[PDB]
Every structure is written in structure tokens, then in C-alpha cells.
Design a protein around this nucleic acid. Structure first.
Lengths: 93, 247
RNA sequence: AAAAUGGAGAA
RNA sequence: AGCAGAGUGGCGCAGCGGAAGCGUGCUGGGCCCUCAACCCAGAGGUCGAUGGAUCGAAACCAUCCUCUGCUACCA
RNA sequence: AGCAGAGUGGCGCAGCGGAAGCGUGCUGGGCCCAUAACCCAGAGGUCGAUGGAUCGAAACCAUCCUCUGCUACCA
RNA sequence: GGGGCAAGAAGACCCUUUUGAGCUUGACUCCAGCCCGGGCCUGUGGGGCGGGGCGGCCGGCGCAGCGCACAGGGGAGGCCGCGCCCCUGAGACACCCUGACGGCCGCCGCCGCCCCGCUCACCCGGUCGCGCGGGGACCCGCCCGGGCGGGGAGUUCGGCUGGGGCGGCGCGCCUGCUACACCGGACCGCAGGCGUCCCACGGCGGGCUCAGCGAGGACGGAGACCUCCCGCGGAGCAGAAGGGCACAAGCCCGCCCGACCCGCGCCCCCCGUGCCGGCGCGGGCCGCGAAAGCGGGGCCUACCGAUCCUUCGCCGCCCCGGCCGCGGGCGCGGAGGUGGCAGAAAAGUUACCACAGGGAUAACUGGCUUGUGGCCGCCGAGCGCCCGCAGCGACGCGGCUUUUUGAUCCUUCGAUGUCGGCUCUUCCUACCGUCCGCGCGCACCGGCGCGGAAGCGUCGGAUUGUUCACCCGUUCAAGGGAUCGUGAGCU
RNA sequence: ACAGCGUCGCGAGGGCCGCACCCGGCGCUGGCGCGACGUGAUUUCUGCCCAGUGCCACGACCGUCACCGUGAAGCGAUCCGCCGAAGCCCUGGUAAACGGCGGGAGUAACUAUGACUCUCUUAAGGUAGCCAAAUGCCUCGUCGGGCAAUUUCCGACGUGCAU
RNA sequence: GCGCGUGGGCCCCUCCUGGUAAGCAGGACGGGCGAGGCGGGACGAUCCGGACGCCGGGCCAGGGUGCGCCGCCGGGGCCCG
RNA sequence: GAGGCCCGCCGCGGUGCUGACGCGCAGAUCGCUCGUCGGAGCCGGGCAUGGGGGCGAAAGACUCAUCGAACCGCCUGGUAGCUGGUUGCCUCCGAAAUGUCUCCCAGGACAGCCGCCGCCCCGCAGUUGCGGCCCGUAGAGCGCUGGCCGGCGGGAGCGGGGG
RNA sequence: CCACGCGCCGCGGCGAGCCCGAGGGAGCCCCCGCGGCGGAGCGAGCGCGAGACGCCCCGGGCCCGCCAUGCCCCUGCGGGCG
């Protein structure tokens, strides 16, 4: 699938349709100050090995891709979840 | 699993040396002031047999330098030594079989036995039947002498270290076939409980890592790493190469 | 340095 | 049982939607002093049958015949 | 996940900004009295893709697909 | 010793249990051990090598114009005399400037690293400490950090299922059927799909007509293009299947992004709970169109995912004695998943084996069945010189039996001793020989068919555990049943 | 089990074990030794293969790969560089290490046949022997011997499921 | 409102699916047994009648009426249940 | 006068009969028949080694009738969706073996059925009639989708044979 | 069977209240005796905060909190009204 480089959609700050440039959202690096990292790091310390479940039986083949639409003037970031697809390209302008 | 035979052996207890009726510790005479300067004269009172040693031993009686009696030393006997020989242990000792002199004094190419790994260690290398070490070279600046151990490996030992001139007696003892299992039992009874030997592929899975299946097979390669764990090192440890070959 | 080969028997 | 492959000149073995192909046999023609080779011709096919499927099928597809390899769950 | 590397004629395999190499296969010249070697040509590579940056890119730098190596694993 | 499925014994086989244990390994998670690094233990002196920073200095080769133009410079004077601006490329370079990449320094009170001693820590040997050594700031030890590590622990090893395994997945979902005209209906029933693809294959407006017949028109025929004509869709609309569709939902254009935002409700499955999917609105913002309208993607029915955690957006609150900056948290809702799809984190083996149970469930006996195995009958195409029937009988048809194996799972798992032989009894007839008839393609002899007939006979041996098989032999040798008769009868 | 036969490690500032630690055993030992393993007297031999998996390199340091230490930034928590020990990777060695030892073509002049050179997988293709064997599915193999008659037996034969 | 048992069912009638079939497996409406006494079907869990406090008399269902064994005759037709 | 030499007594083993026994003489004995009988021999006493440990000429054998992990006490009246049992009488009512989820399939939850406790007042039905709407099965049919068996009558072009 | 926790039912006392808590009273069946719970909810929180009816039951209407949106204004990211 391909996604338009720019789209017109409602920017919540403006309250009206605006041109939104499009980029691909990525999950960011996990922080060590988050409350779950902090609880898992504490739990893991010591003897007894792995204390939390590790998921292994992966069946999914694709991830629903999230497109960051950043508004040209407001800077409002809105996102659209495209239906599961193997390949996504954001077309150049 | 079960502790394997190697693990059970290190606690002694049945695998301890059968040391009863052994004459004593065969050792070179202690270094003394008269050994360091001049030579002490001893007489070979007897040449006897140690229970677990193939090489004959020898009771040499030296005079007591410290006091007024006579002191008896037990020495591994070089071939050719006889009862009523005069053996000199000293820095000024002649190069005759039996005499103990420091390795710097000993000339290069001389067959020596009961060599000291470090000075005043009273005996260490070349103590088994037939075995000998040879003087290779002396570095007089480093006060060190190269010797070739019976293995072939060359060791730099202090020129101060002492050695008995000669080749240990009992030479060519392993040339004769044991022939019977019974002759083996008699040799090992004078040593330690190490015989008879059951192959690990004969034992059940618990007893040995080679263990057992429907057919007797080593399973994985016999070669084991040098960093194996204490109950895992069982086949060929750290083998550089395996197999029969030329040379 | 390398440099094998060459149906039948008839003159 | 059921499973896969094939069936094409006389022998083989290809082909594989548009011919039948190469070797051998199989004669012939060269070739030489003659012979062996060798070369080159000439010919050889219900393509195992049938139905479908096509403008057209050896081919692709169904049916069937024949061979040829694979086959039975301890209690 | 991360850090690194690879992808070149039919095939193997060089090649760092300024050509498209060499081996093999093939096709022929030559070679020899005739072979076999041998020698020499000729043709053969969106230089995985895609976009950029560059006087200009197989190369550089991203991407995207495979492949490798080592390390990673709160879902 | 036939029977009391005689007594032993909560089947050991088999299966089930979210019951074990022994063993294994590249199962999941680990642990001693050991290797390696750095720190501490731990003194006293040297020597070298880098780094970093300064800092001079030497270099830079695709060619017209001036020769190899490293680069970004600056500029009609610096100090050349050349300059320039010329005369030039991809960019001119004069005196002075830095900037990158190299080389050659030197420098430093900076920071690492390695090496060589020394003896006092430490560390071993020798001696009856009797007239001695060997190491050495290392090693060990210890604290951290990284490796190896079934040697050793702990645990796990899905489900469904005409027993279980193997093999499939009706284990989440969809179409037509099964399904018996509301709805609902089962199967390891039938014929098939789904885990994706498309910023256009989407929204909207306009216009259009599709597949084809038929007849025509250079190459041109089966086949491409162009015309009329008639064309109810016989085409297309991403993919299964069924519906649906014609001035359209197909096709082609032109414009666009509603494939938005915020709040709800409902229908399907249904406990009337989720979830996917749809649908109906109240607003905000848009697009298309002249407008009316229509639009929350793809005509409809499939194409997907809890809590916890993470990551990101939006607007605010809180950190509890204040306040400020950072950071953390929280309400809101997306994404990163649990396909075994209402969602443990998980490999084998066991004949060394268990445990609790199960005839909910296999092996074994009986019982139902009879495909298969036997064993008959009907028809009469043909065979039999001729001649359908002396003897045969195809092609079909209708039965029977339980002496074959299946199919099944009714009975038995707090136990019905499971093959064969040996021994011994009895029974059956679907009769091989003998008896009595009768028919022959019955001259005799011998065969062959058929009806009644179960009294007697159906043996001895070689190989195999064999039942069976196969061969030898005789006075020439049927087939079976009795818990596959027969183990407190045996072997 | 065994004698024999190999293979392996190891020179004591060691190896292999024990071991909560303190400390031990082999060791009153010393390579004709000790520990670890295979195979299992003779007689005669032991082929090929280092791809895979082990094992080993004073064999390199390639890529990775930690604390620490060292820079840079910060208000600081911190973060980002650098540094990079073993190990692995990389390169060699090693089968009396574990193990493996197959196919496809072309190849006359009975015509099969390859004896020769050529490929593929994945490194090599089963050599000397041996055989329907305690190892052969088909199988109660085939051909001899022995018997009156033999799923046994003995001698042969051998694409030998699967020596 | 509170809560219990249950969540192995199996038969009959008719309608069905797979299977050669099965006292086989899987479904549907109603009924039954389960959990329903009793009389009959010789015997039987489910069939045919009847569904139950304890009794006395009366009626009579279903199924029968030689004798075991309660209760039968009459008529027409057929005839090796 | 040599030998892990042979025959053979005691001894020490334990082969076969698959003998006796099998409510025994005996929780492994008995009788014959055997293996060996100068040796890796047999036997006594002392001592050493201890439970995931020991010891093992290896059989998972042996460790006091116990060994693929001894025994004793305790944690422990371990846990069991799995078996067995669960104790007076009468009366009144009276099921379910199905729907959905679940590592679920020998179990449970939630619904249904069912009992008890009531509470409140407004009309109720497994029925027929009458009216309105729906449905695509039996049958019937071949227009649709897929089959099918042949006759007859025409020819534009065909596909073969004829002239 | 007993303890303890929770649900619901009945019953007794008292009622916007209610309560042998531990304890203390030369007193233990007598007297005196706190929390607690209920009486106000809702929101993650900052916080804000219920009257309109009615035998009873059910429903509608309306008020309070949470969330949005207008409008007005003080002591103003605050108050009022919708």
C-alpha cells in the first residue's frame, strides 16, 4: 500500500481541516525510569532466574502501521491506523 | 546422575595408596654445610625393594655431621651401585655413579636421576625405573642449567639443584608382557585400587557420561574441553589431535 | 621447461 | 486395497497446443589398392486405447487397460 | 532488537569515483602432416532493486529485499 | 479337575489425570565449579609506548588555460618580477588565510597501557631452624563484571479425536449445501475460502454501455483493430461462494480525501457477556456536485485480539510541610501481542518404572453387522464334433453362513490367565471314502454330477513355535464348533 | 573383566579429583609415572572423508563482545562517545575424535559393459575383507550337499531393505 | 429475593446425515424411561393400555378366553400356523 | 618338577531337571545333576567408606527380608477435578443430562429447569376461529447452472471420405 | 462440627441514629464505658457537591458529580446561567 505525502484532515487545535504531512510512527526506546521497567528490574535482581512471562508463540505476520500526520501550521499530530499490510511506502511530494 | 569413579577417587577411602610396608620416602640427602662446601662420604648398607616402586631403593648410611651418631638415607638406586660402595654427596664430589653433586658442577651430556626441581627440594624429577635426565647446557651468568626431562621437555633448573649421577635401576621393566590378569592384580595391589577398569560405555547412563544405550557407543565426541566441569571431563581432555599417525 | 598418439596387409 | 510414474519407429528413449525427433537396427550411397572405420542419405510411429477439450492435443483433461516402483496400528 | 558485513556475464569471481575486467562454458580462427593439448579472438553482467548526494557512483550515503556472523529478549 | 466368568492382587498392558519418579539433550529457567578482566590486599624505584590537547612543518596528479589545479578563501595590491579582471575549468592559485585527510616533529603538571628491577607485604621449599634458599608487588584471597558450564538442580512437555499415536485441524472466522420453506440444529459430513491486496481498486459529480450474436471493412486467419445492428447482463465489480447491480454498483473522465473529529445507541454471536463485523444518529469540520443529495473507505455477507506492561499523541491534574526547574505518575485512546485466536512462559524418553482411577476407552472372549472370506440359488450369452443345461456356465441377479478379516465399542481394567501343541470328550453337515438310489459326453474299467445318509474311517513322518503351509509315505486320507473347547490338566 | 593394543592430558609456580569453609586424595608419587578414555590374546590387516559437530592452536585479532577506566554534555540524577579481557566469529590442524562412505551423465567393434573424465549434493563416496550371518525386507532367495521327504543345517552366489 | 441438584443420558414415533451394514456413529418435532407402581407383550427399562394415599363394592381398557392358567361362543370364507 | 594346567574330596559357587516344595522344613529350602577346587582362590576377626551419598570384574547390582535413590521421626490429618462410604420417620413440592466460556473434554462458572421465601395488584393462554404479512422444502419442471438419449427437417461456411 | 469472612432471609431492641469495645466501678446476669458503622454522593485527581414532584412499586421528569458546549459577570483558567 502507499500513503499520500500530505492529506487534509481535522487538526484539533485549529478545529478545522488542514494539510497534514505524513511520516511513519515507530515505537520508541524503552526508558529505565518507567514504573514497569523499575518493577521488572527489581524483581529480576537476585536468584530464581526469570520471574516474568516471555512470549514466544508468535503468529502475526504484519503489524498495523500507524501514520503520523503532523499539521503544517498547528503542529497537531494525529495518526491513522492502516489495515494490516506487508509493505507501506509514504509517497514523496 | 551418580558421582562417577573419578569423583569418588578424590576422597581417598579405598582408592588411597596401599602404603603399608613401604620402606619410606626416597629422597636426596638434605643439603648441609658439609654438602655445600666439600663432600660427605656414605656407604651403601643395602639395596632393597619398595612395595609400590619398580626401581630398587638403597640404604646409604652417612656420618652425622650435626652430632655423633650415623644417619641413614633412602635413595632411588642408580644402576651399578653395589652394597659397600662409597657414595659422596657434595659440591666437591667426583663424577662417579651414585655421587650427588650440584647440576652446575655436573658436566653437559651426563645422565642424571633424582634431580631436584628447585635447590634443597630433596628429589623430584627422574625417579622411576630406567628414567634419567641429561644435562644440556649451563648458563653461568643466570646460574641456571638446562636439563631434558625424561618426557623430552627442556627445563631450566638452578645450577644449585643437586642430582645423583646415573640412570635409575629397574631399566626395561615394562618390556615384559604382564601376560595374565593375575599379574596385573599383583602389581596394582602394591599400589592403589585402580584395577580392574570398566569402560564407561559398559556402565549405565547414571554412572558415566559415555553411559549407555541400545548399543555401546560414546555418543558425542570423546574430546572434551579443558574447561569442562569436574564430573564431565571423562574422555580425551583438551586433545590437540587424535588418531594414530606417522611420527 | 613441456613435446603420447598414428586400424588391415599389400608392395 | 489405496499411491506415484510411464506407455512414442523393430529396440530404445526425447518431445509436450502448430513436427514426429536422435541413436541403433536398416539398406543404400560415398571412401580406399582393398578392408576397417567414418561420413551421408532412405525409410520406420492407431504416439496404449476412448471420450471430452479445442481452429487445432502425442501433448491438456476425464475414463479405462497394462506394466513398473511404495504399502499395513505395539496393546 | 542492535552492531557489523555481502549480493558482478550462462556460471564462478576481481574491481574504489573518471573501464566493465579475468577464469570457465560457448562460438569460431589459428596450431599440427592429421590429431589431442595449446594460443588467440568474439559475444555475454536493470554491476539485487529504489531514491538521493556528486563534474560524473558497481563503488559514496540512505532505503528495500535476501544472506551471513556475533550479541540482545519486562509482551 | 468340567463348572462355581474358583481363590490369590484397588490390571503391570492401554487410556485418562492440568498424578509422579528415574534418565536424556542444542526443552524452559537456572546453580556450584573453572576461566578471564578490572578494583582492594600492595611496598619502593626506573624505562618505554600510545591517546588527548596544543603545535609547527612536509605533501597531495581525470586537462584547456600557466604546471599535479586537496578544499572553502579573499583580492587591482600585497611584496613576485606576478599581479589581477583577462589569457581560464568541474573549480585560477598573486601576499596572506584558515578547513579536512595523511606523513615528519616537538611539546605537556593531561590520561591510559606495557616492561624491568628491588625487598619489606605476601608466598612456598630445606633444616633436629648446625652453620640455607626460591619467588615477589605478581600469585592467592575477596568484591564486581563478562564467558564456559545437564557436571548439577527445579520445572514443563497443549487440545480435539468412532482407544491412543501417526496424519489432519469445524482450535478464531466466512459462502453455498447437510437442514427436513420462521428461527435454531450434529459429525475427523459435502464443495470450497480467511490471516491479505488497493491513496486508488477510495469519496463524489458528469457522461457512457458490458459480454457477445449477425453482417460488413488493406495486410487479417481461431485469434488484436474499425463500423453499424440487436443486445435483461448471458460482462465486469481484488481474491471463496452466494446474493446484488444497467442513463449503475460496471467503464471512463474531472475534482478530491469522510480511509476526518467528538459523543452515543442498536443489530449479529449471545449468558442476551465480551470480541470482530456492520448499522442508526446528535453535533464539529470537510469533499463532490448547478443543486437535491451523497460520503466514517473498497456493493453485501470473511480478512482479526483482554488485564499487566511498554511506546506515542492530546489537554490538564498530582507528587501529600512548601515553592521552582527536571523527572515520575495519572485520567483520555492508539500502537507493540497472545492464530492453541475469552489471551500459561515450556523438549524428549522410560522394557527400570510408578500413582489415582477408567470397561467413560484399546489389545482379548462373547454379542450386533457381513464389506471381505466362505457357501448356495436364479437367468441362459456361449463351451461341449453336432448339441444352452452329461459336465460347464460368462454377463448380471437374489440370498445364506459366522469356520476369514474388518466395522463397532454392548459386557469385563478392586484382573474371565492371552498362541500353538499334547491329552480327552462331545457336537455340526455345507459328505472325502464306505451305504442306498438316480443321471452321464455310463461298452468294461475307471471317473463325474446329484438326492437321502453323520454309523465308521480320515493315519505315520521331514522342515517350522507355528495355526496354516509344503513335501514324503500308507489301506491314498472332508471341512468345521464347543470362552479362537481344553494352563488349580500339562508343556 | 582381562593380557595386548592405541589415543589423551600433565614437569609439580603442574595435572586430575575431593571440598561449606579450613583444608585434602592420587602422592612414602615423578613421564618405564599418574590421571583420563576407547578397543579387547594371537595371526593378518585397519581404506577414503575435516563439509557437519566436537577438540586444539606464544594462530591471528577480522567482526562482535562487559564492569571498570577515560572524554563530552547536563542543575544533577543521567546520557552519549571511547576503550575493549577471555569467549565466539575468522583462519589453520585433528577421524585408533563423534561420525559419514550416494546419485546423475558420456564411454566400441555381439550388446549389455564401463576399464575412463565428468558433474551434483554435503566433505568423501564403501577399499581389503565378509555375507541371506545373532546383520537380507522381499524370503520358506537361488544353485549345490545331505534326507524317503527338510521354513532347519553346511558350501557357494550377492546393487548387501539397512555388511 | 435466596439457593440446590444437574451439565456421561438413552429409547419410541416419524423425519434425516456418514456407513456394505450394525443392539454403529451423528442430528430434528413430540413423547417415554431416567425418576412411573399396576395389567398385558411367555420372559424385557423404554412396547400396548394405564400413570400410584388406605380400603370395600361396581365397571371395564389393553391383551386375551383347549389345559397348565383367570376368561368363548355363534356365523361366513380359506387351509401341510 | 613348571603351570591364573587337567581329573577329583572338603570348601566355595549354582547349570539342568524348567525335579520336590509351593496352606513349605524354609519370606528362596531340598534332592540329584553340575561350575571350579593353588588361583584375579576360600574363610574368620579388627577397621575404613553414608544416602542423590557410598561401593560396583557394571547386573542400575549392592548398602541388615528395603534400592532406577536405605531406614526412623517429624513437616503431615501433605494434596487429589479421582474411587469408596456418609447413621431416624412422616408429609408437602420436585429436576437435569442442554446454551455460552474455560490448558476445556472424568471438572467448573453463567443461563435454563427446580425448591423455598415472599411481594404486589392487574386480566391470562404450547388452543381454535378470523384478518394481514413472511418462508423456497415435498412435489413439479428443465427457462437458468450443470447434465443427458436419440429421431426428423434444413443448409452460409465447414470436417472427412465419394464423383 | 467449630472458628472466621461475605451474601441474603427472618426476628428482637432502639431510631438519624446506633453500639455488654478495651477497660474502669472494694463491682464481675449490675453500673459506667471510644473508635466504628450509618447519616452524601461522584470524580484518576485538583476537587465539587443533590429537593420537584410521590401511600407503595415501576417509569418519566428534574437536581449533584464526572465530560463537552454557549452566554453573562464580581474577589477571574474564578463565580453565575443555561
Amino acid at each position: 500500500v502507499t500513503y499520500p505525502a500530505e492529506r487534509r484532515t481535522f487538526c484539533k487545535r485549529e478545529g478545522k481541516h488542514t494539510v497534514h504531512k505524513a511520516s511513519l510512527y515507530k515505537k520508541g526506546k524503552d526508558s529505565l525510569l518507567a514504573q514497569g521497567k523499575r518493577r521488572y528490574d527489581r524483581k529480576q535482581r537476585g536468584f530464581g532466574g526469570q520471574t516474568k512471562p516471555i512470549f514466544r508463540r508468535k503468529a502475526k505476520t504484519t503489524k498495523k502501521q500507524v501514520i503520523r500526520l503532523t499539521c503544517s501550521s498547528c503542529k497537531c499530530q494525529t495518526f491513522q491506523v492502516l489495515k494490516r499490510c506487508h509493505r507501506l511506502e509514504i509517497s514523496r511530494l | 546422575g551418580r558421582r562417577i569413579r573419578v569423583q569418588r577417587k578424590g576422597a581417598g577411602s579405598v582408592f588411597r595408596a596401599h602404603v603399608a610396608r613401604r620402606l619410606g620416602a626416597a629422597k636426596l640427602r638434605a643439603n648441609d654445610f658439609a654438602e655445600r662446601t666439600g663432600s660427605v662420604r656414605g656407604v651403601v648398607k643395602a639395596i632393597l625393594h619398595d612395595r609400590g616402586r619398580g626401581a630398587p631403593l638403597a640404604r646409604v648410611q652417612f656420618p652425622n655431621m650435626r652430632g655423633e651418631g650415623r644417619v641413614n638415607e633412602l635413595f632411588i638406586a642408580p644402576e651399578g651401585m653395589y652394597t659397600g660402595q662409597e657414595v659422596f654427596s657434595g659440591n666437591k664430589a667426583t663424577l662417579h655413579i651414585g655421587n650427588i653433586l650440584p647440576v652446575g658442577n655436573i658436566p653437559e651430556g651426563t645422565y642424571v636421576c633424582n634431580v631436584e626441581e628447585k635447590p634443597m627440594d630433596r628429589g623430584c624429577l627422574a625417579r622411576a625405573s630406567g628414567t634419567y635426565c641429561l644435562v644440556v647446557a649451563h648458563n653461568m651468568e643466570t646460574n641456571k642449567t638446562r636439563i631434558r626431562l625424561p618426557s623430552g621437555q627442556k627445563k631450566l633448573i638452578s645450577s644449585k639443584a643437586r642430582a645423583m649421577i646415573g640412570l635409575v635401576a629397574g631399566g626395561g621393566r615394562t618390556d615384559k608382557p604382564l601376560l595374565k590378569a593375575g599379574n596385573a592384580y599383583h602389581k596394582y595391589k602394591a599400589k592403589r585400587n585402580c584395577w580392574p577398569v570398566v569402560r564407561g560405555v559398559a556402565m549405565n547412563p547414571v554412572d558415566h557420561p559415555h553411559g549407555g544405550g541400545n548399543h555401546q557407543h560414546i555418543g558425542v565426541s570423546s574430546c572434551v574441553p579443558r574447561n569442562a566441569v569436574p564430573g564431565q571431563k571423562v574422555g580425551l581432555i583438551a586433545a590437540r589431535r587424535t588418531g594414530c599417525s606417522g611420527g
